[PDB]
Amino acid sequence: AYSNNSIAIPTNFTISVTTEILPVSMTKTSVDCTMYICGDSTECSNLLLQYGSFCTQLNRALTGIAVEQDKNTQEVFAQVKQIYKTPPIKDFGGFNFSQILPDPSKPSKRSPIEDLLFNKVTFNGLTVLPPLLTDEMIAQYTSALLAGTITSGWTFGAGPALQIPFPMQMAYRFNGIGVTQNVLYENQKLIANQFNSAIGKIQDSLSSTPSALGKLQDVVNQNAQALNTLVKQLSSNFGAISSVLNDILSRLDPPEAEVQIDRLITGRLQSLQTYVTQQLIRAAEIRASANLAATKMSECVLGQSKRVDFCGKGYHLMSFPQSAPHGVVFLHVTYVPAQEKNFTTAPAICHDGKAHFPREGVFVSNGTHWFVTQRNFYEPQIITTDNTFVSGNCDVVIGIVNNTVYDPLQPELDS
Amino acid sequence: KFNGLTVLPPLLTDEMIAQYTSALLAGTITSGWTFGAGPALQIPFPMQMAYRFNGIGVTQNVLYENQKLIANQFNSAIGKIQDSLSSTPSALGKLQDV
Amino acid sequence: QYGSFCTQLNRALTGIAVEQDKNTQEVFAQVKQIYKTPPIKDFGGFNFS
Amino acid sequence: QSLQTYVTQQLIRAAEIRASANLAATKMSECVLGQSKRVDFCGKGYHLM
Amino acid sequence: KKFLPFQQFGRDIADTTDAVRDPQTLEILDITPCSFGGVSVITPGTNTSNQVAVLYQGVNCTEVNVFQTRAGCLIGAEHVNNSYECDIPIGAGICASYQTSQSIIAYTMSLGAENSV
Numbered sequence: 001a002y003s004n005n006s007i008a009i010p011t012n013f014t015i016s017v018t019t020e021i022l023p024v025s026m027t028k029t030s031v032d033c034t035m036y037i038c039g040d041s042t043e044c045s046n047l048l049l050q051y052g053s054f055c056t057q058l059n060r061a062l063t064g065i066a067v068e069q070d071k072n073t074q075e076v077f078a079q080v081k082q083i084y085k086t087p088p089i090k091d092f093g094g095f096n097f098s099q100i101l102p103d104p105s106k107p108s109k110r111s112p113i114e115d116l117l118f119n120k121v122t123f124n125g126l127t128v129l130p131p132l133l134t135d136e137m138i139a140q141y142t143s144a145l146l147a148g149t150i151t152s153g154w155t156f157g158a159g160p161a162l163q164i165p166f167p168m169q170m171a172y173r174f175n176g177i178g179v180t181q182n183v184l185y186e187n188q189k190l191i192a193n194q195f196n197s198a199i200g201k202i203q204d205s206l207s208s209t210p211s212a213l214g215k216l217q218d219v220v221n222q223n224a225q226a227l228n229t230l231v232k233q234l235s236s237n238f239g240a241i242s243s244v245l246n247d248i249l250s251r252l253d254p255p256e257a258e259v260q261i262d263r264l265i266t267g268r269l270q271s272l273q274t275y276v277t278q279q280l281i282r283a284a285e286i287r288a289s290a291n292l293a294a295t296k297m298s299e300c301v302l303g304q305s306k307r308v309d310f311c312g313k314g315y316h317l318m319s320f321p322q323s324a325p326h327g328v329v330f331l332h333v334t335y336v337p338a339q340e341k342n343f344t345t346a347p348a349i350c351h352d353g354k355a356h357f358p359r360e361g362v363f364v365s366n367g368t369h370w371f372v373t374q375r376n377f378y379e380p381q382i383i384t385t386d387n388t389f390v391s392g393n394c395d396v397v398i399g400i401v402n403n404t405v406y407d408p409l410q411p412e413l414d415s
Numbered sequence: 416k417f418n419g420l421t422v423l424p425p426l427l428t429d430e431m432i433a434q435y436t437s438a439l440l441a442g443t444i445t446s447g448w449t450f451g452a453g454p455a456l457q458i459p460f461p462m463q464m465a466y467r468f469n470g471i472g473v474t475q476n477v478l479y480e481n482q483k484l485i486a487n488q489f490n491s492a493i494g495k496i497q498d499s500l501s502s503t504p505s506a507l508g509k510l511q512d513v
Numbered sequence: 514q515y516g517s518f519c520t521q522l523n524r525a526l527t528g529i530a531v532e533q534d535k536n537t538q539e540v541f542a543q544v545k546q547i548y549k550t551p552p553i554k555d556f557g558g559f560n561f562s
Numbered sequence: 563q564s565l566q567t568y569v570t571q572q573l574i575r576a577a578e579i580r581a582s583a584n585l586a587a588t589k590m591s592e593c594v595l596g597q598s599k600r601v602d603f604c605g606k607g608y609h610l611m
Numbered sequence: 612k613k614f615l616p617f618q619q620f621g622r623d624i625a626d627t628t629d630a631v632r633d634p635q636t637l638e639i640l641d642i643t644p645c646s647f648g649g650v651s652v653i654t655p656g657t658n659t660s661n662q663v664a665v666l667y668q669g670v671n672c673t674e675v676n677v678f679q680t681r682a683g684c685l686i687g688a689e690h691v692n693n694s695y696e697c698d699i700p701i702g703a704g705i706c707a708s709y710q711t712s713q714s715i716i717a718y719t720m721s722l723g724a725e726n727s728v
């Protein structure tokens with residue numbers, strides 16, 4: 001309902017907590033090319049040796065991929081130089097963080113949401129190498145980031161961790177999005193209750209829907225499919241008399257066994273090159289995801305991003321990290337303006353022939369009287385010389401409206 | 416063509432992408448950035464520009480005292496876009512290359 | 514006799530084709546509602562035609 | 563071999579197009595749906611819209 | 612596993628045999644490849660010293676100062692309770708370093724000095 005003299009200003013707001021899942025690392029699969037192609041067969045091994053460096057460079061590429069996976073995990077999670085801890089007293093002004101804070105009762109030091117996340121994701125020369133950082137170490141890193149954010153705001157990211165009461169931190173976050181910080185303190189209990197409810201709904205939202213963790217599960221499924229296809233390729237003949245190398249060795253003398261083994265070597269080497277190329281491309285995608293996750297942890301969690309839709313829908317307030325198998329989950333707390341009203345507006349106000357413009361906020365009218373309010377929350381104030389500034393006159397501004405501007409010094413002079 | 420190579424139509428047609436861009440344009444014109452954060456809140460377009468002006472560190476009275484000049488310059492810049500595009504062929508290379 | 518090579522190539526091409534639609538969806542479908550401009554074009558002198 | 567070469571090139575080009583589409587989605591979110599303060603992200607000068 | 616009377620062999624998802632039936636005696640015995648993994652050499656700079664440790668990846672300490680970690684069997688490396696910054700990443704939370712007299716050692720890496728606000 002656009003018109004040249006009408007505005008809609010929110011009168012009420014909500015806390016929104018949204019979930020963003022980002023893959024970070026792949027499974028560190030290593031392939032022994034010689035064992036895959038020539039299983040303990042000296043004849044085949046000597047034939048494979050004729051291809052030069054085709055075999056070793058595949059192992060080099062896979063080793064580089066595994067090192068890159070460890071590097072990705074370190075970049076995403078090892079963003080803090082100290083392990084911060086929350087105080088034993090949870091006097092956070094009514095904000096309940098028990099659902100994202102580590103649970104000591106459990107054998108692992110994981111939060112309930114982290115356990116829910118972990119429960120929802122599932123001999124041919126092929127080995128898997130364990131990641132450098134275990135799940136408990138990733139949980140420790142996320143706990144340190146969580147404690148730093150809760151007890152020190154963005155200060156632990158820029159420099160040393162400076163303590164601040166959490167409602168005061170939320171007032172900072174309010175001023176960050178252009179809403180005056182008195183709105184928080186006047187509505188502290190409502191904001192805390194809405195935040196707690198939004199955190200509580202996250203468990204159900206993730207648990208009920210079985211495709212919520214689809215990104216991480218798709219990464220795992222793609223890797224498993226690639227490995228399974230690589231294994232299945234060993235049963236192919238590739239034009240040879242038998243897919244079994246031992247059968248060819250037992251049946252044929254070297255002069256023709258070598259031809260059959262050469263056919264098998266060509267086929268299996270081509271299979272390895274295909275697998276390694278697909279792994280390199282998928283590793284590039286995962287590295288892009290990990291870089292995005294590291295940027296999101298730096299800017300969404302360690303700070304307050306002003307980038308639209310970077311930290312979820314709405315005006316960003318804060319983010320909380322949670323570890324997940326092969327990835328990270330960000331809980332983005334944002335402001336969503338909820339209830340709005342339709343007012344009339346004016347670009348300026350003519351008092352004495354001078355034009356008054358609001359220093360911050362907008363002029364609004366409730367039918368008969370004119371007020372000045374902050375842009376993102378309806379809070380009417382009397383239009384005074386301390387809310388407005390003077391520039392120009394009423395003969396220049398298009399659509400200026402006559403009104404009276406209150407001067408607080410006049411009755412002080414008169415009294 | 417006849418060798419097993421086919422092309423599949425995209426899920427969103429040109430009309431649907433045009434509708435999406437039209438919706439984004441209307442939201443931007445009539446509600447500023449409010450349609451992206453949450454509920455779209457109408458605001459006069461002339462009033463929306465000073466908020467944008469305020470973002471770059473320029474006061475609102477700069478836009479209100481110079482509203483006609485700014486509108487004329489914006490319209491002239493839009494006409495120039497169309498002129499440039501049709502006049503020089505290389506412009507849309509990033510797409511054509513693909 | 515070559516196993517799954519044909520299937521792997523087809524699967525990769527299908528993945529690319531799906532990714533193209535995903536790309537278009539993420540670029541353009543960023544607004545939930547279809548907004549329309551009013552028949553009134555009084556935007557203070559700004560011409561969006 | 564020809565098919566494998568074609569599919570590999572298509573995968574690499576699809577990755578590049580995906581990067582471009584992610585950049586376009588970011589630009590639509592931060593410059594069409596907002597007012598970006600990032601220098602040269604959305605044109606020379608001080609971004610308005 | 613129980614074989615049907617006409618069944619003799621067992622084919623794995625790649626034409627390898629996991630299980631089998633003997634001609635001399637009908638008892639069926641499953642088959643597993645003996646063992647395999649990756650030998651890695653943990654060393655400091657040769658400019659610094661020439662002592663090394665050998666990690667047999669993804670295997671026990673039986674098939675091969677024999678600390679048994681989750682990465683595999685570590686031979687030659689002293690196990691140290693103290694944590695440090697990871698210098699040589701081994702895996703599964705284990706890193707190695709060359710420290711003072713001097714020798715190579717393996718430890719669970721530290722994630723940083725702990726703190727509290």
Ligand SMILES: *[C@@H]1O[C@H](CO)[C@@H](O[C@@H]2O[C@H](CO)[C@@H](O)[C@H](O)[C@H]2NC(C)=O)[C@H](O)[C@H]1NC(C)=O
Nearest residue numbers: 090091092094095096097098099112196199200
């Ligand atoms: C934070 O919320 C949790 C629930 O999500 C609260 O834990 C509950 O505490 C009540 C006692 O007031 C018990 O009866 C429930 O059994 C608890 N539920 C669970 C799941 O533990 C917790 O007390 C809240 N913390 C604060 C500080 O309010």
Ligand SMILES: *[C@@H]1O[C@H](CO)[C@@H](O[C@@H]2O[C@H](CO)[C@@H](O)[C@H](O)[C@H]2NC(C)=O)[C@H](O)[C@H]1NC(C)=O
Nearest residue numbers: 011012013014015189190191193194197338339
């Ligand atoms: C803003 O909205 C909130 C709800 O999001 C309102 O709080 C509710 O108020 C009703 C009374 O009408 C209570 O029954 C609910 O229990 C309240 N909910 C919560 C979470 O506290 C709030 O009153 C609204 N404020 C204004 C000024 O309209």
Ligand SMILES: *[C@@H]1O[C@H](CO)[C@@H](O[C@@H]2O[C@H](CO)[C@@H](O)[C@H](O)[C@H]2NC(C)=O)[C@H](O)[C@H]1NC(C)=O
Nearest residue numbers: 343364365366367368369370371380381382383
């Ligand atoms: C707009 O707000 C003004 C200021 O509050 C309202 O005027 C007040 O009306 C209330 C209730 O009728 C009275 O308690 C005050 O004495 C009035 N103040 C003045 C200075 O007149 C006005 O009613 C509102 N306008 C509308 C149409 O709602």
Ligand SMILES: *[C@@H]1O[C@H](CO)[C@@H](O[C@@H]2O[C@H](CO)[C@@H](O)[C@H](O)[C@H]2NC(C)=O)[C@H](O)[C@H]1NC(C)=O
Nearest residue numbers: 349350351352353354394395399400401402403
């Ligand atoms: C705002 O008030 C000013 C005067 O304070 C009005 O300007 C007057 O306009 C009338 C009719 O055109 C003239 O008779 C007066 O001489 C004008 N006074 C001045 C100082 O210019 C103006 O019309 C009012 N604005 C509106 C739209 O009501």
Ligand SMILES: *[C@@H]1O[C@H](CO)[C@@H](O[C@@H]2O[C@H](CO)[C@@H](O)[C@H](O)[C@H]2NC(C)=O)[C@H](O)[C@H]1NC(C)=O
Nearest residue numbers: 490493494497553554555556558559560561562
């Ligand atoms: C917006 O600009 C367009 C041109 O870019 C205007 O359309 C022209 O209107 C004149 C009449 O004054 C015609 O002679 C031209 O043929 C039109 N050109 C085109 C391309 O349609 C349009 O009137 C302008 N709108 C406003 C509200 O100023």
Ligand SMILES: *[C@@H]1O[C@H](CO)[C@@H](O)[C@H](O)[C@H]1NC(C)=O
Nearest residue numbers: 001006008339340341342343
């Ligand atoms: C304000 O008035 C317009 C006029 O049509 C209407 O569409 C809009 O819903 C109104 N806003 C509220 C909050 O009632």
Ligand SMILES: *[C@@H]1O[C@H](CO)[C@@H](O)[C@H](O)[C@H]1NC(C)=O
Nearest residue numbers: 003004005398399400553555
């Ligand atoms: C708004 O437009 C109406 C025409 O519908 C006009 O009468 C009025 O003067 C305009 N007001 C402003 C402030 O531009």
Ligand SMILES: *[C@@H]1O[C@H](CO)[C@@H](O)[C@H](O)[C@H]1NC(C)=O
Nearest residue numbers: 632633634635636637638639
């Ligand atoms: C000898 O005959 C057959 C040959 O395999 C075998 O099944 C049988 O058990 C042998 N006799 C024995 C083991 O007493």
Ligand SMILES: *[C@@H]1O[C@H](CO)[C@@H](O)[C@H](O)[C@H]1NC(C)=O
Nearest residue numbers: 670671672673674679680681
């Ligand atoms: C193999 O290592 C495991 C620990 O994972 C150990 O329990 C076991 O004793 C080792 N091998 C044998 C046969 O003892």
Ligand SMILES: *[C@@H]1O[C@H](CO)[C@@H](O)[C@H](O)[C@H]1NC(C)=O
Nearest residue numbers: 678689690691692693694718
């Ligand atoms: C390290 O601490 C544990 C506690 O049981 C144990 O291995 C031992 O006491 C320490 N290591 C030694 C003795 O070198």
